[PDB]
From a paper:
OXA-48 confers resistance to many carbapenem and penicillin β-lactams, but only slowly hydrolyses oxyimino-cephalosporins such as ceftazidime (CAZ).
K51E increased resistance development by only 1.1-fold compared with Q4. Similarly, the overall active site architecture (for example, S70 and K73) was maintained in all variants. To estimate how the conformational dynamics changed during evolution, we performed ensemble refinements based on the crystal structures of wtOXA-48, F72L and Q5.
Author numbering:
A (entry chain A), B (entry chain A): 24 to 265
Write the structure that this text describes.
Amino acid sequence: EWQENKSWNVHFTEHKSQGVVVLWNENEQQGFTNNLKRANQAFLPASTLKIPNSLIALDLGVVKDEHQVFKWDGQTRDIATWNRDHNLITAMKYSVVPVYQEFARQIGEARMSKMLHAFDYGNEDISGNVDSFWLDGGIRISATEQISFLRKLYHNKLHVSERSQRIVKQAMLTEANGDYIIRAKTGYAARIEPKIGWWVGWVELDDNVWFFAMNMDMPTSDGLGLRQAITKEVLKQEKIIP
Amino acid sequence: EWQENKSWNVHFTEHKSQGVVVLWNENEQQGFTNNLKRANQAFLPASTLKIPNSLIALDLGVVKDEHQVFKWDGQTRDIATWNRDHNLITAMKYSVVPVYQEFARQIGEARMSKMLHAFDYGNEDISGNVDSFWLDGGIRISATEQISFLRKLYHNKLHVSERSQRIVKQAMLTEANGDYIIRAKTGYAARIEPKIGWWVGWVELDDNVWFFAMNMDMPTSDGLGLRQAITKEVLKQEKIIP
Ligand SMILES: [Cl-]
Ligand SMILES: [Cl-]
Ligand SMILES: [Cl-]
Ligand SMILES: [Cl-]
Ligand SMILES: [Cl-]
């Protein structure tokens, strides 16, 4: 069904980068990618896992609502945006590990793992857990599998309450203007080679939705902004955004 | 409690305009306005009434969700954006009267009026209904009363379901970036003198919310864009947005 579009590769090669973008046109039920093999290659999810972990935290009542404040413990960590109070909205915006580590302590490895499987979120890998259970959830996930999960979230079809799904979609809000809305989540799997950056989400237009999932080789946090830039170059080429 | 800030008047006079901006700092429970008398002056709500009317339509099941399509009837009306299919999101974005007129036909004048009173939305005026019941709801509302209603919506405190309130807040989304989110609704009461333009809503920041409600004299649809521009000049002066 899927269509390969190798002309998107220039957006990667212009930035001396290697990666994949996957797009799904919801109205047409049609997928597109620059590289079919890499679209199906599973990687550690890094902070893209915050989307399902937020659903779990809400649906178990670990997080009461998007307003609840998770106070800073006063310990100065390396990422300055972590050294402040957060709610679910801001914890997702700044990918605040200490906040989600606390969620995971309350959720527990057993509940987390079972609810992820109920979401059909990626698949367990031969390597098992390679860090802490909350950083990778014992799974790896491909770009096409991200799309399938996000489509379920969009349609409120995951096996958590509608409310939990609506709150997470709110927390995903990244950009909005008169032309489009982007709901998305970044990630950077930076501990184990190959180091991988992600951006996954969707673009809402007046009359359609375009799901996207991209990942790219990211040996250093220098090209982090290429995750969004390359994706947007594809979206612009396809006339999805101006 | 309220504080008057007459330095905001220049943003109106620079555009040969007269009007009011009201701001409410949620963390501090403090209100500010350029003109206390006009802040309390009631006007026809025009399309700002689409916020409560959307709540009513959802909570009665006239609108099933924000995805339901209200097809164009194929009749070419004066406003080009009306001459197409819409959902609740787009009907609010383009202030699509024919769509909301159909909602009102299904809701009914009795249910609409009673639910508006349950929201404490403005007050009935001596003039009664001055057009059709769905265009003004038999009420007039002040900028400060808009604030009070919007604060209830923000906190899910209105007497409709939480779901209905969350869907309407989604449909209010107007702009979002790394610095702020604006959820808002325009209006233009253009049939009866004095003709009035409105913009009402809030600005979400990482650590606070600022509610706003502005109206202005609008003898012609030429300065419609001043509703947002003047509001944003106030927000910038107050360092709420960059
Ligand atoms: Cl693994
Ligand atoms: Cl994002
Ligand atoms: Cl009236
Ligand atoms: Cl939203
Ligand atoms: Cl607006």
